[PDB]
Amino acid sequence: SVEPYSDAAFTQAQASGAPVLVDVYADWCPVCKRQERELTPLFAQPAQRDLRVFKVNFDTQKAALQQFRVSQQSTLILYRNGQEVRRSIGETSPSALSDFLTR
């Protein structure tokens, strides 16, 4: 699933046991645009079937940025079982983004 970040939906996703992707975007970022392109089909693939994606708007959700220790748009943070596994900034290789979600 893909949904806008909110406190309540994020906390419920983290308590669910499912993997969670925090995707920090900006409406005027060509990298972000580019990422979104390549991530959208990856989100629909069977290996991603349990992934809960939250889109954090860099411009409007500043409390979320502090929580996630995020200083740049195009940051991706992957959680499993409620704990951060890895993060990535600015990556636009389709194979690298696939592997970021999969490994």
Residue numbers in the entry: 0 to 102
Would you copy out the relevant sentences from the publication that reported this structure?
The gene of ETAE_2186 was among the top 3 upregulated genes and was annotated as a hypothetical thioredoxin; here, we named it Trx-like protein (Trxlp). Furthermore, Trxlp could mimic endogenous TRX1 to directly target the TRX-binding domain of ASK1 (ASK1-TBD) and inhibit its activation, subsequently suppressing Erk/p38-MAPK signaling, correlating to limit bacterial virulence and replication in vivo. Taken together, our results provide the first comprehensive, functional analysis of the E. piscicida Trx family protein Trxlp, a novel virulence effector that mimics endogenous TRX1 to target ASK1 and suppress its activation, thereby inhibiting the phosphorylation of Erk1/2- and p38-MAPKs and disrupting the expression of inflammatory cytokines and diminishing the host antibacterial defense.
Trxlp displays a similar structure to that of the canonical Trx fold, consisting of a β1-α1-β2-α2-β3-α3-β4-β5-α4 topology. Trxlp contains a central β-sheet composed of 3 parallel (β1, β2, β3) and 2 antiparallel strands (β4, β5). The structure obtained here is in reduced form, as evidence by the 3.3 Å distance between 2 sulfur atoms of 2 cysteines in the CXXC motif. Trxlp can be superimposed to Trxs from other species, with root-main-square deviation (rmsd) values ranging from 1.54 to 1.74 Å for around 100 equivalent Cα pairs. Minor conformational differences among these structures were observed in flexible loop regions connecting α helices and β strands. Trxlp shares a conserved structure and critical WCXXC-motif site not only with bacterial Trxs, but also with mammalian Trxs. Notably, either mutation in Trxlp (W50F, C51/53S, FSXXS) or mutation in ASK1-TBD (C250S) significantly impaired the interactions between them. Taken together, unlike the classical Trxs, Trxlp might not exhibit robust redox activity.
